[PDB]
Amino acid sequence: AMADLEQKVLEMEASTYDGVFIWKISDFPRKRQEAVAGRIPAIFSPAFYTSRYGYKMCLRIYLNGDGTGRGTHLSLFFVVMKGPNDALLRWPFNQKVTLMLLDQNNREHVIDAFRPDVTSSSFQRPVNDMNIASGCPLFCPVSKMEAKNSYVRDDAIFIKAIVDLTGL
Amino acid sequence: AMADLEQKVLEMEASTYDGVFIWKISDFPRKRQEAVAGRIPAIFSPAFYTSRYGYKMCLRIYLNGDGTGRGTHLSLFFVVMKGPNDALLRWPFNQKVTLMLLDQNNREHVIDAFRPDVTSSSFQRPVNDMNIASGCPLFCPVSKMEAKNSYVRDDAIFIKAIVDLTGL
């Protein structure tokens, strides 16, 4: 209950309530290796929300890829989580989501966006803590970022997510 | 102790600073019974604020009623609390307050509102931790909500408070 409180505090510290989230991933080189090695393929980010009492969401990343991108790309996914106020929200979750890998030279960010499918189980009201993730298996070529460039800086990268709030 | 810190974290986690607060009350059936039994007549909600450094407030609810509503209605009250920045605020507190019991079918919420009386002890600058509560003794007939309907769902209800910020 100390790592539980510690974890809670850590979660609160990272939460945002306007649909915009910036996830700094430090110790990049080590985590990158742990992915390549197959020890820790993926990492979950802290949770964030669409509004003070809105949808609860988090991100999941595979530094060395997943599925169609396994070993060739950085795969990034969006996750709808069971939120405390789900009973008050509209389902399925259907807000457009934009995912980005920030260029720390601020000249060319890697960006992609997707429209949730109303028929996918990924966006129905959560029964478990997290619904099945969905996103970009081929988000970024390992060569592009990682292998230097301006995405990795001082052994860290920044992932940014923007959830369109239209209709909320 | 660890109970002190843990309590602070919970408070911080529930705080809002824009005059809007949604209070989710879980274990509704049990709490409802504890009120009917007379063991725990009322419950206080976590605190929320009108602005980052605004008035501090909380709600107090009697699942089996208080005063004129005892045994017949759900009584809901508003409470002005001693805030850390009270010295910088205007007194008496005189913002219009709207109290709601949310319909989880989102079609017919129970709603009431009141205008604080500048002559009431309930709204003067707090001397004690909490001023005398003020609100709605006959907020909602026990029959309406509670006894099924669409207010209680999966053993929980949602109370919402909106403090008008005109002039702040």
Next chain:
Amino acid sequence: AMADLEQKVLEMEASTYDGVFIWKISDFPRKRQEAVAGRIPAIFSPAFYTSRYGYKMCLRIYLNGDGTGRGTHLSLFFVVMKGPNDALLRWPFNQKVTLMLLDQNNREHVIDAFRPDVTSSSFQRPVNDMNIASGCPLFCPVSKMEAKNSYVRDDAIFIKAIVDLTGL
């Protein structure tokens, strides 16, 4: 230890993310003496930010003065701190800053403002936890506030900082 987590909780509780910060200093008389006595000349305030992922900053105050104000005035300084997202921000920090000592009678606040100098090391990207502070050595005559008046009330004063967000 616990003091580590307790400290983090304290910092989170005080943080703001819109460039506006109000610092309540309690036990004023005692702290004032500790300054006059030379035991504790300065005090740092909790940190606050320009935006959710913006610059990290704090204030430093000398209740009995510093440098040109030592012994005659209250000296107040602004501090740019190493922030978690500095890599994504523009450097040097060059936002106009307004510092205030609030009149609790709300009629005459002590106010001053300054323009960061793009050539000062105080505003370059932080290498250490905190850059050199800069601000107002002659912010307020010890006679004005402190010595009574309406700045000190119930043994407390309020310092307010407003960071102009133009261009951010």
